[PDB]
Short mmCIF file of C-alpha atoms and ligand atoms in Angstrom, two decimals:
data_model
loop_
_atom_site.label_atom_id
_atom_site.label_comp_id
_atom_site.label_asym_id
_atom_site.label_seq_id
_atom_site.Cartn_x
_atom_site.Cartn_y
_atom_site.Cartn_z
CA UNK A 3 -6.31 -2.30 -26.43
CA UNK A 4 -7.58 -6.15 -26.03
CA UNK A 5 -5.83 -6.36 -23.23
CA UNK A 6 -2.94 -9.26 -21.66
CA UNK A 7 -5.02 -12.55 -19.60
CA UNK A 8 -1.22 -12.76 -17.90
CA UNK A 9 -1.39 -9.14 -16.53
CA UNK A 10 -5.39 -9.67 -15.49
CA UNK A 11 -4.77 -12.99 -13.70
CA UNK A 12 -1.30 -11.82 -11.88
CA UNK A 13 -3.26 -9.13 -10.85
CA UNK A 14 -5.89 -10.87 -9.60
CA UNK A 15 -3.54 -12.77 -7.63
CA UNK A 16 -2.32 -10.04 -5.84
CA UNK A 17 -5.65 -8.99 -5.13
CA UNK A 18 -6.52 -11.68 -3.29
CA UNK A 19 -2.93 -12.14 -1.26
CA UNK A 20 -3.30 -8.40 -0.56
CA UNK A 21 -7.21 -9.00 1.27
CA UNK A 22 -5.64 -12.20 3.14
CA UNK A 23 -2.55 -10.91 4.54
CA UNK A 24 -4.64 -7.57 6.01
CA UNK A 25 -7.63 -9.41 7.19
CA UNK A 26 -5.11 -11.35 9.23
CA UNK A 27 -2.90 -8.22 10.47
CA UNK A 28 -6.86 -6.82 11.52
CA UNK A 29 -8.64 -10.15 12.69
CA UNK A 30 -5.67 -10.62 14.61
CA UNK A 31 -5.60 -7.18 16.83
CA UNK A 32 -9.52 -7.86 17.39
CA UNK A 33 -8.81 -11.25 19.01
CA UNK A 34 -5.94 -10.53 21.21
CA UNK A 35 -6.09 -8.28 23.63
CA UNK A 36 -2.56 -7.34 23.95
CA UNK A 37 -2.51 -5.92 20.22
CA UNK A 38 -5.31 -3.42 21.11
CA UNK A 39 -2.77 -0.27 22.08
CA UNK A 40 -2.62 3.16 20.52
CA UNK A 41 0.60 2.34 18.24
CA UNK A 42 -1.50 -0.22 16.71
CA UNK A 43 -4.05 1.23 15.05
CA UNK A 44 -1.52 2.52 12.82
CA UNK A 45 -1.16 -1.03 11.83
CA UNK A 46 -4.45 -1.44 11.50
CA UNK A 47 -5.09 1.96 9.50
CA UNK A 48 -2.68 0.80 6.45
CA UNK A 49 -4.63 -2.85 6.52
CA UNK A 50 -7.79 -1.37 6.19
CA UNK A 51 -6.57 0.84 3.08
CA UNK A 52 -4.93 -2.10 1.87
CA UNK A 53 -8.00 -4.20 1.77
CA UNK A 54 -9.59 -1.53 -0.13
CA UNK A 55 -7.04 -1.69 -2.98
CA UNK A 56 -7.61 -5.42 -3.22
CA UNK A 57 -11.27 -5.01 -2.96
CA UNK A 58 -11.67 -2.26 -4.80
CA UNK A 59 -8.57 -0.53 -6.61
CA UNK A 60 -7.39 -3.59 -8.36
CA UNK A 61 -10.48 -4.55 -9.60
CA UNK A 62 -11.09 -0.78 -11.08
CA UNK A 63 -7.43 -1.09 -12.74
CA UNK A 64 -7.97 -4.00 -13.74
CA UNK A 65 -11.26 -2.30 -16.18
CA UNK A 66 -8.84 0.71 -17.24
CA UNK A 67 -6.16 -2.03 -18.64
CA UNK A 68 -9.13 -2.83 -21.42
CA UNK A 69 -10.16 0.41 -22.83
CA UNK A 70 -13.62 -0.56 -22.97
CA UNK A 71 -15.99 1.94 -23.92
CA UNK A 72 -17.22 5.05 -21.89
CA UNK A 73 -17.78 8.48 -21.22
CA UNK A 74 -14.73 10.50 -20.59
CA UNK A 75 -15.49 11.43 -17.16
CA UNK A 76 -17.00 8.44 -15.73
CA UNK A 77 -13.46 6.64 -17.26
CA UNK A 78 -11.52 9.32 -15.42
CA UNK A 79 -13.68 8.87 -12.20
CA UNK A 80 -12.32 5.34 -12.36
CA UNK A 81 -8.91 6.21 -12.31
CA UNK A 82 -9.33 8.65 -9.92
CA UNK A 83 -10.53 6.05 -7.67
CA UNK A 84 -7.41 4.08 -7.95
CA UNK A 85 -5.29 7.34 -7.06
CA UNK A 86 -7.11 8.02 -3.72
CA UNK A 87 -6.84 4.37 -3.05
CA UNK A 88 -3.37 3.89 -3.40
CA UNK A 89 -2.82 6.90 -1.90
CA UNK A 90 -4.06 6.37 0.87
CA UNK A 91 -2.41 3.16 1.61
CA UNK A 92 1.21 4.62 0.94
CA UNK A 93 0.04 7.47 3.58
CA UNK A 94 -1.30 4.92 6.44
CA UNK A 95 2.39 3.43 5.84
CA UNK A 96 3.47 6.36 6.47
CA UNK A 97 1.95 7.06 9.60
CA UNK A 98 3.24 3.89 11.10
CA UNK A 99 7.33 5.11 10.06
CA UNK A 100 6.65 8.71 11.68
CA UNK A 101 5.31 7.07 14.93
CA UNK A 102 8.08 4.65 15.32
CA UNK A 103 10.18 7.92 15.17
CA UNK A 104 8.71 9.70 17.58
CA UNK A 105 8.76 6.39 19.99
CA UNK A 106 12.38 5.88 19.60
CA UNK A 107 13.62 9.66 19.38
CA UNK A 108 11.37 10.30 22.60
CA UNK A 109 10.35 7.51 24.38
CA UNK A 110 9.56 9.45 27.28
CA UNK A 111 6.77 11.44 26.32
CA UNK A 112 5.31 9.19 23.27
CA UNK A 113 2.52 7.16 25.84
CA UNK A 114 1.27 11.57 26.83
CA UNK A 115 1.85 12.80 23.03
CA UNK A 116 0.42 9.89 20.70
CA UNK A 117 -3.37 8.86 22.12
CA UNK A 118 -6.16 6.81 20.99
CA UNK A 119 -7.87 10.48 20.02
CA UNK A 120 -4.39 12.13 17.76
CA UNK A 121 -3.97 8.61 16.38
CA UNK A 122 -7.64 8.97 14.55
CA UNK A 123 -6.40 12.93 13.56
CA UNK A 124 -3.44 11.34 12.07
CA UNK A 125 -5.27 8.64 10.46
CA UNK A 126 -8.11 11.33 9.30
CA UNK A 127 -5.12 13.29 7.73
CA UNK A 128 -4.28 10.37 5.84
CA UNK A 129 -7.94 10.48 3.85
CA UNK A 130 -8.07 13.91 3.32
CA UNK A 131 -5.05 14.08 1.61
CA UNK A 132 -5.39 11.02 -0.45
CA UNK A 133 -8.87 12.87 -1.50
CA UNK A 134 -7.29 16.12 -2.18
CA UNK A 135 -4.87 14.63 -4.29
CA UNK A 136 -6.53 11.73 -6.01
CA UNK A 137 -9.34 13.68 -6.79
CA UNK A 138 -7.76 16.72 -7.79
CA UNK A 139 -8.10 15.42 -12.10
CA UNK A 140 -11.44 15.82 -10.98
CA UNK A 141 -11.16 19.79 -10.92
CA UNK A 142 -10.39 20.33 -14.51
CA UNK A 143 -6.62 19.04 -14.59
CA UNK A 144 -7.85 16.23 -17.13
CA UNK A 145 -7.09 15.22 -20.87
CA UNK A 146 -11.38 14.64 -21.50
CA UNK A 147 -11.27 17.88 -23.38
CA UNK A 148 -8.98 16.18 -26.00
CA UNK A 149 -10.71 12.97 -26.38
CA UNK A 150 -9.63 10.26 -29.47
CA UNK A 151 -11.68 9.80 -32.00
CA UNK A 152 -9.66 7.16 -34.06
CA UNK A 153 -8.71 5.15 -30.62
CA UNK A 154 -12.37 5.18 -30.26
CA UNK A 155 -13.54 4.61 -33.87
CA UNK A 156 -11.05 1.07 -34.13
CA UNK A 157 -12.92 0.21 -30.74
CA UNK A 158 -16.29 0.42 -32.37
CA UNK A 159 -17.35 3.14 -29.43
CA UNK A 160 -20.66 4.93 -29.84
CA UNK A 161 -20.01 8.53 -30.29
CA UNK A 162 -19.51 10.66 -27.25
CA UNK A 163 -17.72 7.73 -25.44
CA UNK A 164 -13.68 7.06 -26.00
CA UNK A 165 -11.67 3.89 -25.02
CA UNK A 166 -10.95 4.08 -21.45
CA UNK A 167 -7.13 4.07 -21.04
CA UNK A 168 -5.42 5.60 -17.95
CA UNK A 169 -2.89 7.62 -20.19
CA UNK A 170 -5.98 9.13 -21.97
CA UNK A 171 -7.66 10.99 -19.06
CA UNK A 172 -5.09 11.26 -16.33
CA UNK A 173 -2.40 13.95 -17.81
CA UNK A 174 1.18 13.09 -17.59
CA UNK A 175 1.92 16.59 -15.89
CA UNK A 176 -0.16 15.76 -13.13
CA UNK A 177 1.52 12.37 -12.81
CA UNK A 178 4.98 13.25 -12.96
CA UNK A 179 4.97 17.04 -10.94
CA UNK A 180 2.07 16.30 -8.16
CA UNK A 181 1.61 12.89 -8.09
CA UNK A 182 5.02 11.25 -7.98
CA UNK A 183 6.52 13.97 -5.65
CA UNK A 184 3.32 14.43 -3.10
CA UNK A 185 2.70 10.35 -2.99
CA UNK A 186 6.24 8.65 -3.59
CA UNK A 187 8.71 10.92 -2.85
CA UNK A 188 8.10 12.70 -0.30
CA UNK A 189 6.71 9.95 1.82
CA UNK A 190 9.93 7.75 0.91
CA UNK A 191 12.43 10.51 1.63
CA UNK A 192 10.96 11.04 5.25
CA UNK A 193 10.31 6.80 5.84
CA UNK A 194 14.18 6.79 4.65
CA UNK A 195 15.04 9.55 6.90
CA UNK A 196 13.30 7.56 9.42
CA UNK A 197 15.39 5.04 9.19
CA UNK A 198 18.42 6.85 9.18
CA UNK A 199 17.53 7.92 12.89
CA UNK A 200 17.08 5.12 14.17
CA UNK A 201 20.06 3.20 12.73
CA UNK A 202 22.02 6.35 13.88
CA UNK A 203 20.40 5.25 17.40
CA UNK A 204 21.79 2.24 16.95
CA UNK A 205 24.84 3.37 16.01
CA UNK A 206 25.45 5.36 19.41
CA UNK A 207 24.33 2.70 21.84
CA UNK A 208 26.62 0.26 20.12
CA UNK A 209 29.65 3.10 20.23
CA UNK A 210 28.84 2.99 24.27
CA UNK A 211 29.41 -0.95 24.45
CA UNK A 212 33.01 -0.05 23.66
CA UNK A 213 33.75 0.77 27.18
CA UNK A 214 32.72 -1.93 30.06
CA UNK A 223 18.25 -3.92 26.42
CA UNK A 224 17.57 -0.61 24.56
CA UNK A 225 19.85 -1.63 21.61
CA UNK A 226 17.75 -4.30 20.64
CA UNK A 227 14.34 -2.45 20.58
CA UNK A 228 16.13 0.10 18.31
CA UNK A 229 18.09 -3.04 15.57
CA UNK A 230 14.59 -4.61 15.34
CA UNK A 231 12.95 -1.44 14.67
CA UNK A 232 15.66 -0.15 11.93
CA UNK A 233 15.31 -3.99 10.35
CA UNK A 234 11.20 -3.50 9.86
CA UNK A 235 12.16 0.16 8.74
CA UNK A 236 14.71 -0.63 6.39
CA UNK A 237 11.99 -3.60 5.01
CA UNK A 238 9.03 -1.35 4.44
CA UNK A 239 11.50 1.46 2.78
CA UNK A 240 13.09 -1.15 0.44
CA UNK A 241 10.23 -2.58 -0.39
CA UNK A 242 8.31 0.51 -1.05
CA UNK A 243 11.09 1.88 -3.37
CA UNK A 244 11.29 -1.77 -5.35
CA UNK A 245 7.03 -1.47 -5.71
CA UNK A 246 6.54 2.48 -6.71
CA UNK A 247 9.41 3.69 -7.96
CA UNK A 248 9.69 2.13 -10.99
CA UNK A 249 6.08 2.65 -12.38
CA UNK A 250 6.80 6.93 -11.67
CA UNK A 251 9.92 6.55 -13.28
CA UNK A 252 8.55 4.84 -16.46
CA UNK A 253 6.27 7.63 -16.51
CA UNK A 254 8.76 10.40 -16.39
CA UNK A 255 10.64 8.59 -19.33
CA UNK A 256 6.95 8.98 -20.87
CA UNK A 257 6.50 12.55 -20.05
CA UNK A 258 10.30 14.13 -21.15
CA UNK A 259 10.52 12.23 -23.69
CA UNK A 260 7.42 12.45 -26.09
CA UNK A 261 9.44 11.85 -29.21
CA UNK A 262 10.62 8.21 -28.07
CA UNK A 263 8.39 5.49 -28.72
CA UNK A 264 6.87 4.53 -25.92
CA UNK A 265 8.23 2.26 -22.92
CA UNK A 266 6.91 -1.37 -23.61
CA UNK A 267 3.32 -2.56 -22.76
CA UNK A 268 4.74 -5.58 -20.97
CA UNK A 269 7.02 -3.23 -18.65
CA UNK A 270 3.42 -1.09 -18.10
CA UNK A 271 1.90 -4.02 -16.73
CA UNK A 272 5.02 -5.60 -14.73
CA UNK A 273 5.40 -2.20 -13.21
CA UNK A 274 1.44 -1.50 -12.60
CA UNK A 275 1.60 -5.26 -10.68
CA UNK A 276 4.85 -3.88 -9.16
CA UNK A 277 3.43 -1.09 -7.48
CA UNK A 278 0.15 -2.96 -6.53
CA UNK A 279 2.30 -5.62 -4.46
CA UNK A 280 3.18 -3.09 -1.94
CA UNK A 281 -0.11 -3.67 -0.64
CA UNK A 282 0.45 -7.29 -0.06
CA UNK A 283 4.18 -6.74 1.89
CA UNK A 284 3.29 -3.51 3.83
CA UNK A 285 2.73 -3.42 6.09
CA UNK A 286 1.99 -7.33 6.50
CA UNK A 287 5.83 -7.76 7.27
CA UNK A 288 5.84 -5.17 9.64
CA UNK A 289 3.35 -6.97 11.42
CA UNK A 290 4.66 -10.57 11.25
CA UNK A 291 7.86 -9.06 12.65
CA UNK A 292 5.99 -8.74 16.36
CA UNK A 293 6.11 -11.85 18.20
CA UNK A 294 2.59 -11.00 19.02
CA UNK A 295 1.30 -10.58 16.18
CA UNK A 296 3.01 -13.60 14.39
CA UNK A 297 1.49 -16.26 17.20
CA UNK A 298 -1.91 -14.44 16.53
CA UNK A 299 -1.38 -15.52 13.37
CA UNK A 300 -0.36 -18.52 14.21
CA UNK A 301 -3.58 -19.57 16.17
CA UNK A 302 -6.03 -18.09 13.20
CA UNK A 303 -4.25 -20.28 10.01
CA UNK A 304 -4.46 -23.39 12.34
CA UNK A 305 -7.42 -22.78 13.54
CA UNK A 306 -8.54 -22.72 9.71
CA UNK A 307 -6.55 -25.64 9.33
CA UNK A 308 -7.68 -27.98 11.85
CA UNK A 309 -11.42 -27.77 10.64
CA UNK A 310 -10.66 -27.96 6.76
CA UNK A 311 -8.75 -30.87 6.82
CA UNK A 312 -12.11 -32.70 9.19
CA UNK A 313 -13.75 -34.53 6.22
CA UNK A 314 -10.67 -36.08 5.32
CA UNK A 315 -9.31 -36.53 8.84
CA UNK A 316 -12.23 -38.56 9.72
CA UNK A 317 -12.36 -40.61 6.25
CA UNK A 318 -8.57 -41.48 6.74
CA UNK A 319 -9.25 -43.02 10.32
CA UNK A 320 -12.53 -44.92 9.10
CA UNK A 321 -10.50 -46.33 6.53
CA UNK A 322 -8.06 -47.51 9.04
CA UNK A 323 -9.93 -48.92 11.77
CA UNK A 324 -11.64 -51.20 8.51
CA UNK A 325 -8.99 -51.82 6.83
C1 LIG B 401 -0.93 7.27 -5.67
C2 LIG B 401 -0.17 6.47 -6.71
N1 LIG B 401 -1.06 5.67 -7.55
C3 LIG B 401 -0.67 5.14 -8.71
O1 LIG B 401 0.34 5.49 -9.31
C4 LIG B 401 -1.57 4.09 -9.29
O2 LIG B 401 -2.24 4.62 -10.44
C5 LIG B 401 -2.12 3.74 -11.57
N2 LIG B 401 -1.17 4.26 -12.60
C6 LIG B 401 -0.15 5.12 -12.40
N3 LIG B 401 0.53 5.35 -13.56
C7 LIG B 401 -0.05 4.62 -14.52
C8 LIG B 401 0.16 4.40 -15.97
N4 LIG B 401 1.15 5.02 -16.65
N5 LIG B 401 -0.69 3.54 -16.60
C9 LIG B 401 -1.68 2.92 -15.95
N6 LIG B 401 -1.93 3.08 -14.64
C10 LIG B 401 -1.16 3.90 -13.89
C11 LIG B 401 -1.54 2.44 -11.03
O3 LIG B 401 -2.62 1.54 -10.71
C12 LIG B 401 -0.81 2.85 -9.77
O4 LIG B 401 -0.81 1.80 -8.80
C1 LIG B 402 -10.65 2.84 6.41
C2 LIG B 402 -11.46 2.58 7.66
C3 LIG B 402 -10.87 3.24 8.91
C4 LIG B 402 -10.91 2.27 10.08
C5 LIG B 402 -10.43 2.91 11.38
C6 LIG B 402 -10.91 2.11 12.59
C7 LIG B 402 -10.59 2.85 13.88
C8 LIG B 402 -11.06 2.09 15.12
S1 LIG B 402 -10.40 2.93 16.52
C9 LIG B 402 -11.03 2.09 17.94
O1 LIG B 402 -12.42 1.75 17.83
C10 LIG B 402 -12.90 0.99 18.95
C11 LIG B 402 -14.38 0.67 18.77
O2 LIG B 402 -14.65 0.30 17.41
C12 LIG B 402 -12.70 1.74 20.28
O3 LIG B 402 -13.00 0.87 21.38
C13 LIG B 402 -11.27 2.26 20.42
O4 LIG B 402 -11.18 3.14 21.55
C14 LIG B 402 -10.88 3.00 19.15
O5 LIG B 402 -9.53 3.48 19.27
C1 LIG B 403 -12.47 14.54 9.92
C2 LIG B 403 -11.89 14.92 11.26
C3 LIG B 403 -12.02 13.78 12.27
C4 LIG B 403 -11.46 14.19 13.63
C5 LIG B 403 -10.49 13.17 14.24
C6 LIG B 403 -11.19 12.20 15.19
C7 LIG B 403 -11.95 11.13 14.41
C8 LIG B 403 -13.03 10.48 15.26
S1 LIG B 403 -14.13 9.51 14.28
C9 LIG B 403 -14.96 8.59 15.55
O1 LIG B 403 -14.76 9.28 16.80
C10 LIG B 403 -15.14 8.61 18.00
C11 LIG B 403 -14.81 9.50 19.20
O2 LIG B 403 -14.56 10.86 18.79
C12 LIG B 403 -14.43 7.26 18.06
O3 LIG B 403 -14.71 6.57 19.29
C13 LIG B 403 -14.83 6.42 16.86
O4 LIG B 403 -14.21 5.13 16.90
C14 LIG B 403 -14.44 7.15 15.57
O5 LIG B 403 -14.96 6.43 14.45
C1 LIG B 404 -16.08 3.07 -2.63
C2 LIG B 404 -15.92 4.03 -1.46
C3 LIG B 404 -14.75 3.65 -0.56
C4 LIG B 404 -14.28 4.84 0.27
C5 LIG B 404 -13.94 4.41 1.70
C6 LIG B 404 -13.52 5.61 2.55
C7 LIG B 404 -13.32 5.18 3.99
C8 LIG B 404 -13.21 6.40 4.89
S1 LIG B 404 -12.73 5.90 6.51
C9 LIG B 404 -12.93 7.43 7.38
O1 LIG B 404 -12.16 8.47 6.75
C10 LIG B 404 -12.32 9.73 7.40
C11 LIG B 404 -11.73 10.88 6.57
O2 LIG B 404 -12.18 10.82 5.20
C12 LIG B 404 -11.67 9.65 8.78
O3 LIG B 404 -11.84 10.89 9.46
C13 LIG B 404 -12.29 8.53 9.62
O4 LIG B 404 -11.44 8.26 10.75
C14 LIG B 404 -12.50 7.23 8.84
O5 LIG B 404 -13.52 6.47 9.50
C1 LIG B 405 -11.03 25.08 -8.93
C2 LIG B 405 -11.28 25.00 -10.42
C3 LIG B 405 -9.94 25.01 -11.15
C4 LIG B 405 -10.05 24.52 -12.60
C5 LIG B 405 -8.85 23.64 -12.95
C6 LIG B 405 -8.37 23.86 -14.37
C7 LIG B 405 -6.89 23.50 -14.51
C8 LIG B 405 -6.66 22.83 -15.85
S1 LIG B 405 -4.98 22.96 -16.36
C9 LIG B 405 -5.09 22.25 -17.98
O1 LIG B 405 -6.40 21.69 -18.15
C10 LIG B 405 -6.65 21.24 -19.48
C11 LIG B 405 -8.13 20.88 -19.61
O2 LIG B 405 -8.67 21.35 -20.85
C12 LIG B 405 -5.72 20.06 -19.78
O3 LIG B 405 -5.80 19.76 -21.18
C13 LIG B 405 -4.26 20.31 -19.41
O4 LIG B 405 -3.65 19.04 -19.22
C14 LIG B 405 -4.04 21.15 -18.15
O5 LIG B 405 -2.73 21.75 -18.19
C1 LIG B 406 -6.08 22.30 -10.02
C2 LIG B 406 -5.13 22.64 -11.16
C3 LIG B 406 -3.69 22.77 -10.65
C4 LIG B 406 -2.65 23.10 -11.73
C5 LIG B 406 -3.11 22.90 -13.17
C6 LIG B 406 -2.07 23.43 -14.15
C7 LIG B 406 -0.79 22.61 -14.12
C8 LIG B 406 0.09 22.87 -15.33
S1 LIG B 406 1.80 22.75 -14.87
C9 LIG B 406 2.58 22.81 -16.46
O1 LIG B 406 1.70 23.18 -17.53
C10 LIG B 406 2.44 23.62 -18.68
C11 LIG B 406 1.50 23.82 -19.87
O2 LIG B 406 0.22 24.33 -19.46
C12 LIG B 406 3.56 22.61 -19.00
O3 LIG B 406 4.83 23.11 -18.56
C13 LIG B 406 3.34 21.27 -18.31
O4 LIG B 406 2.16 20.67 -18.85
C14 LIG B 406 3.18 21.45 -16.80
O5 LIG B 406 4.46 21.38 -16.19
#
């Protein structure tokens, strides 16, 4: 239960990459002026929520990796927290695949059917269902009315707390039948789906060439689908399967604590690539970025700018 410095530290890492890449994707759309459309704050939706798991998801898993000492429910509250949070990041990613869709299947309508005003609804949507779900351990569907004495006895625990373990107040039903299917599944069969539509655009346009600018709006797009899909498969699907190994088979031994934590960082790292690569895949949005890092760079490197030339000119 001490805990692994490796996992805490690699963790933190990804904490920290996760709040600079989305600060970036957002600083940028304030600055220029051409980023501020409706199909951005999409973008800037799944940013926001992945700021918050750097900021504040990480940190919280980061405390249920130790199994310190607490009450039940404030322990469950805790990884609760880390549900919604997650949750609501893979949903904002979401968002951003399912208007891509709708701007590629009908282009014609899009700019009348997705405004500034259904764009918050959508993004509202997002919240409430990472709520519902995250939360709903909250309700009763919890393991605190079977807490461990001898897990919290070897801790040295005063009585009426327990070691605070994920796996010992989130149930592995609720994992494996709401969670995984509502929060991974789902959302990657329809960003795959997606994708398929839009490569099957691509598909048809290029058919058409056979015989003697649209083509490469919809190849770009399938690329930065195909990216966040791939991506988002490699990051959560591993973690959800470990944990249906854990739940049908209770008689195995369980999967190895070094896999736990490689697949925990796994999953967190989604928050660093989505969408940031999205992002960095608009010309706009890369110069942005562009003019911000040098910027930064071009007033850090001052001090020893200006010591460099003194030395020169007395040298
Ligand atoms: C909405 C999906 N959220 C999660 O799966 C997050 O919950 C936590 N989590 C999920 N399964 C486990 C587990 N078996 N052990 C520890 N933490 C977990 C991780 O931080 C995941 O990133
Ligand atoms: C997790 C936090 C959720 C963040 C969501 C931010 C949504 C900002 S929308 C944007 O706000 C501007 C003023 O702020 C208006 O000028 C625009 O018309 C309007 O479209
Ligand atoms: C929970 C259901 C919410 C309904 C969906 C719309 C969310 C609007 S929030 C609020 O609305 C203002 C205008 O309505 C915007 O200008 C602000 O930027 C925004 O922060
Ligand atoms: C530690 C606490 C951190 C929790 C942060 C939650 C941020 C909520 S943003 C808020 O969500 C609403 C629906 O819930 C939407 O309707 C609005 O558009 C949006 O402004
Ligand atoms: C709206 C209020 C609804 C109340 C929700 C109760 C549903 C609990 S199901 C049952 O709960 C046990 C708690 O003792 C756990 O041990 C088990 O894992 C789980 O199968
Ligand atoms: C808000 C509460 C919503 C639903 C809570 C009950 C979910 C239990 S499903 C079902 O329970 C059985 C034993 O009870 C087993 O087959 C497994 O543990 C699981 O597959």
């Amino acid at each position: 239960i001490m805990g692994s410095s490796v996992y805490i530290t690699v963790e933190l890492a990804i904490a920290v990459l996760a709040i600079l890449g989305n600060v970036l994707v957002c600083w940028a759309v304030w600055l220029n002026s051409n980023l501020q459309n409706v199909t951005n704050y999409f973008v800037v939706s799944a940013a926001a929520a992945d700021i918050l798991v750097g900021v504040l998801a990480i940190p919280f898993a980061i405390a249920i990796s130790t199994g310190f000492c607490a009450a039940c429910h404030g322990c469950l509250f805790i990884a609760c927290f880390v549900l919604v949070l997650t949750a609501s990041s893979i949903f904002s990613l979401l968002a951003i695949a399912i208007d891509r869709y709708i701007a590629i299947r009908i282009p014609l309508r899009y700019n009348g059917l997705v405004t500034g005003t259904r764009a918050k609804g959508i993004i509202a949507i997002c919240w409430v269902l990472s709520f519902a779900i995250g939360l709903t351990p909250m309700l009763g569907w919890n393991n605190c009315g079977q807490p461990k004495e001898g897990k919290a006895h070897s801790q040295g625990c005063g009585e009426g707390q327990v070691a605070c373990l994920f796996e010992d107040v989130v149930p592995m039903n609720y994992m494996v039948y709401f969670n995984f299917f509502a929060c991974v599944l789902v959302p990657l069969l329809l960003m795959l789906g997606v994708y398929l539509r839009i490569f099957l655009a691509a598909r048809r346009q290029l058919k058409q060439m056979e015989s003697q600018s649209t083509l490469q709006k919809e190849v770009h797009a399938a690329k930065s689908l195909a990216i966040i899909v791939g991506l988002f498969a490699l990051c959560w699907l591993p973690l959800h399967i470990i944990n249906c190994f854990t739940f049908f088979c209770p008689d195995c031994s369980h999967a190895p604590l070094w896999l736990m934590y490689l697949a925990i960082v796994l999953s967190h790292t989604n928050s660093v690539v989505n969408p940031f690569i999205y992002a960095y895949r608009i010309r706009e949005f890369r110069q942005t970025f562009r003019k911000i890092i040098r910027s930064h760079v071009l007033r850090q490197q001052e001090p020893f700018k200006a010591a460099a030339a003194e030395n020169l000119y007395f040298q």
